[PDB]
């Protein structure tokens, strides 16, 4: 549901995710690095299923962050694909791909894969 | 076909993979890196479906290579997971995971993922 996803979330590394889910399936917000002052904010955009199933099934969603803002440019982008599971302890469980811009020759090691779990802290 | 996996395969990067498929599912061989060279060779071991479905599906298989030999140790290991399709143009289509041994701090970016297609040409 949109309300359920809207809010502030943190993951196990200490990074901050602030998102707003719109009625049309859109996701907009900011992602912040683990601790590290204020200028560590990056724009994020994504999409979620605004009409999930009844059942105790998660809501699929995903978003992307291009690691460039007015202070830094890491020439990379990460996309998180996962499910939002609501309840008293709501969580967003994801798998992510981080791709860096490389030359033709290092393209073979341009992508890292990992997983993050986010816990909701504010609405 | 079943023991159609046995042979020498090459991927788009120029690495060579030489394997023997045992009747019961084992995969054993050598994986050699760039240039060909002398011991640019590493041991590989894996497993495959020795009784694949009788529908035109490919044969599932997978293998691992730890990047250490008597000359180099890159403190990493790669696993390739995929399927074999035989015929006129036999290929092994894979996706792989390369994990490096890191300290906890770098564990978040310890694994790279990619894909490779091997042919006997």
């Amino acid at each position: 549901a949109e309300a359920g996803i809207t809010g502030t979330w943190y993951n196990q590394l200490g990074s901050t995710f602030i998102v707003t889910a719109g009625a049309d399936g859109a996701l907009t917000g900011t992602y912040e690095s683990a601790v590290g002052n204020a200028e560590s904010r990056y724009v994020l955009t994504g999409r979620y299923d605004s009409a999930p199933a009844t059942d105790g099934s998660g809501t699929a969603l995903g978003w992307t962050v291009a690691w460039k803002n007015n202070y830094r440019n890491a020439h990379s982008a990460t996309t998180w694909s996962g499910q939002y599971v609501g309840g008293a302890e709501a969580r967003i469980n994801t798998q992510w791909l981080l791709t860096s811009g490389t030359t033709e020759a290092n393209a073979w090691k341009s992508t890292l894969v990992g997983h993050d779990t986010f816990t909701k802290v504010k609405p | 076909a079943e023991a159609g996996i046995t042979g020498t395969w090459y991927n788009q990067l120029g690495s060579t993979f030489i394997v023997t498929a045992g009747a019961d599912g084992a995969l054993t061989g050598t994986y050699e890196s760039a240039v060909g060279n002398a011991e640019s060779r590493y041991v590989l071991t894996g497993r495959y479906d020795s009784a694949p479905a009788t529908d035109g599906s490919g044969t599932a298989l997978g293998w691992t290579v730890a990047w250490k030999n008597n000359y180099r140790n890159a403190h990493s290991a790669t696993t390739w997971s995929g399927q074999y399709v035989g015929g006129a143009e036999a290929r092994i289509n894979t996706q792989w995971l390369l994990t490096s041994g890191t300290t906890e701090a770098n564990a978040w970016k310890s694994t790279l993922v990619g894909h490779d297609t091997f042919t006997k040409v």
Binding site: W108 | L13, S33, W67, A74
Partner: peptide
């Protein structure tokens, strides 16, 4: 890394 292409 030995998994990648040559460093030529």
């Amino acid at each position: 890394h030995p998994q990648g292409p040559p460093c030529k």
